[PDB]
Design a protein around this ligand. Structure first.
Ligand SMILES: [Mg+2]
Ligand SMILES: [Mg+2]
Lengths: 236, 243
C-alpha cells in the first residue's frame, strides 16, 4: 500500500504480473515460471525464526503458470531466492514470503547460491547498514553465446514437469542513498555457475545499460541521473 | 452511434496479457522488450472487413521500427538483413484491407518475428493465414491471436533446453515455433475454436495445417498467456473441428 510505494519509489522496472508482498515487490514471468524482477528497500533499522519458513507456491497466480518444489527436487539446482530471506527479518510474515516459489529461480548451489551469490547479498546488506535508504533490483537473465557456426544462441535448461527456466546469469542492481537525495549505484551480472571464492564481486560490475538491455527492463527510471554521485565504485 | 470503438471491438474477448501494449489502427499488439518481437497480436475480422478498399496497396508499405518503444528494446531492418530469416508479420498484411494506414502498420517491426522463408512464412504459415480468412468470410465475427513460442527439447544429457538463435546487433529472438488461435462466431454468441502450433521450420507443402492442432491449454501453457479466457465453455460448439 504505502509500503509498496516506499519500496518502488524510484520506479517499476516493468509492470508484468506484479505482486506486492509484506516487504518486497515482485514481477512474475508466466513463461519462465520465475520472476522478471524483484525490488527491495532496505534501511539500517529494517536490517523471528527462518526455520519456520516453507518453500511453497504463491497461489495468487494462475495454476497453469506455477512452479513447484518437485520441479527443483532432484534437478541439480537450489531454490534460489531473489529477494533474500536475510533482507526481511523484521517479521515472520515478511521472511515467510521470501520462500514463495515466485521469488525463486533455479540456481547452482555450491559455488553460487551458497557462496559467491551469497557474498554479493551480504555485501549489499553491509553497505545498506551504513546508508540512509537502499534499493535493490534482482532478476534472472538469459544471455546469448556465440557457437561453432558463428551464430549467437540463447540456450537455457528448463527443469521439472513445469519446465521452470534455469537462467544463464543473474543481475543485481543496488542503489545506496549516501547523503539525502544522493546515490551510489552498483550493477552486477553473475553467471549461474560455480564461481571461485577468490573472485571479487567487482569483477562482475557491468554498466546498468547492460542489465536493462538484457533483461528488457527500465531500472530506476524515475531517478535523476545527476543524483547518482558514484557508479560501480567510481565518483561522478 | 453505439458501434464500438476499434480497440474495444478487437479485444472483446479479452487481453491475453497486458505487457507493453500498442493499439494500432486495426490490430492490437503486446511487445516483448526481451525478445524484440511481440508477445502476441490480436485481430478482429468480419466478412465486410475482408472486402478490399480499392486503392489500398501493400506495395506502398515500408518495413520500419515502431520508434515509440525505448531505443534499447527496438529491432531494426538491419537485424533481419542477411540474417537468413524473413521479417514475418504476426498480424498479416492480408487481414487489413480497409485503409492504407491500417496495412502500413502491419509492417512495423514490433509486429515482425524472424521466420523461415521458403517452406514457412511464404508457404505453410501463409496457408494457415489463408485458411483463417476463408473461414472468417463465412462467420459473423472472427478473432485471431498470434504469437511466437520458445519451446524446449530433450537433449542427450537427458536434460531439456530451450535454445534459439538471436539475430543482429539487437539480438532479436528467432522463435522455435508460432501459435495461432482463431475464434469463429458461427451464430450469435456461439463459437468454433481452432488452435495451432507450427515449428519455425521448413514444412512440406503437402502437410495439412490441421496436423498442427493443439489443445488451447497447450498454447496457453507454452506462451504464458490467458487466451479467450472470458468465454463460457458452453459458448464453444466446436474445438479443432470436433463436436
Ligand atoms: Mg539464496
Ligand atoms: Mg508472413
Amino acid at each position: 500500500p504505502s509500503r509498496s510505494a516506499e519500496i518502488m519509489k524510484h520506479g517499476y522496472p516493468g509492470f508484468t504480473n506484479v505482486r506486492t508482498y509484506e516487504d518486497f515487490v515482485l514481477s512474475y514471468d508466466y513463461k519462465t515460471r520465475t520472476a522478471h524482477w524483484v525490488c527491495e528497500h532496505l534501511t539500517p533499522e529494517r536490517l523471528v525464526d527462518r526455520k519456520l519458513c516453507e518453500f511453497k507456491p504463491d497461489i495468487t497466480f494462475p495454476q497453469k503458470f506455477l512452479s513447484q518444489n518437485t520441479d527443483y527436487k532432484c534437478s541439480g539446482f537450489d531454490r534460489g531466492h531473489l529477494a533474500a530471506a536475510g533482507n526481511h527479518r523484521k517479521s515472520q510474515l515478511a521472511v515467510d514470503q521470501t520462500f514463495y516459489l515466485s521469488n525463486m529461480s533455479p540456481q547452482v548451489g555450491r559455488g553460487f547460491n551458497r557462496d559467491k551469490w551469497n557474498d554479493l547479498e551480504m555485501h549489499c546488506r553491509r553497505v545498506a547498514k551504513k546508508m540512509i535508504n537502499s534499493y535493490i533490483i534482482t532478476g534472472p537473465l538469459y544471455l546469448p553465446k556465440l557457437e561453432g557456426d558463428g551464430k549467437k544462441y540463447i540456450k537455457y535448461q528448463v527443469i521439472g514437469d513445469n519446465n521452470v527456466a534455469v537462467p544463464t546469469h543473474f543481475f543485481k542492481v543496488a542503489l545506496f542513498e549516501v547523503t539525502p537525495g544522493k546515490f551510489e549505484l552498483e550493477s552486477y551480472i553473475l553467471p549461474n555457475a560455480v564461481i571461485e571464492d577468490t573472485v571479487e564481486i567487482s569483477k562482475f560490475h557491468v554498466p546498468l545499460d547492460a542489465v536493462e538491455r538484457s533483461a528488457g527492463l527500465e531500472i530506476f527510471a524515475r531517478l535523476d541521473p545527476k543524483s547518482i554521485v558514484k557508479e560501480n565504485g567510481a565518483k561522478k
